[PDB]
Design a protein around this ligand. Sequence first.
Ligand SMILES: CC(=O)N[C@@H]1[C@@H](O[C@@H]2O[C@H](CO)[C@@H](O)[C@H](O)[C@H]2NC(C)=O)[C@@H](O)[C@@H](CO)O[C@H]1O
Ligand SMILES: [Ca+2]
Length: 139
Amino acid sequence: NPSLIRSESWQVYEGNEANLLDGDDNTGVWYKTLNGDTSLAGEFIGLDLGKEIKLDGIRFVIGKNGGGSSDKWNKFKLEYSLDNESWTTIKEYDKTGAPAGKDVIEESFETPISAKYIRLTNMENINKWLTFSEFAIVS
Ligand SMILES: CC(=O)N[C@@H]1[C@@H](O[C@@H]2O[C@H](CO)[C@@H](O)[C@H](O)[C@H]2NC(C)=O)[C@@H](O)[C@@H](CO)O[C@H]1O
Ligand SMILES: [Ca+2]
């Protein structure tokens, strides 16, 4: 199965990282950010797929309920890689000001996408910690 990859500096405050791969939207994780409680643009969380595969879509749930429900990136991108070094942006998002809580990011790739790594990546500094609930691919 895909394995979790994320910015090394984050620390788990609540929940467990395996909660991001259990297929349940109601289990997630609350990451403490360093740099003065700030997630820098360019930080990320996503999946190492173990080998190059053809993806038909993703379903990533960001945020969670209760604690840290408001702790989410405002601007971010979905990007993929063959080698964990060079990245291609599938799509960008700006959800500045959106309600706190779980937010399902679900995409279908009309033309399947060949990737070994797929992740969500911060595009703007934010003075928040971070919550997420689930990362899944469709292939
Ligand atoms: C455990 C705790 O309360 N830590 C304080 C920390 O709180 C975090 O601030 C982030 C930025 O406002 C916010 O996104 C987090 O949700 C929040 N965490 C919690 C659990 O409330 C900060 O307030 C810093 C600096 O004041 O102090 C920490 O102790
Ligand atoms: Ca979960």
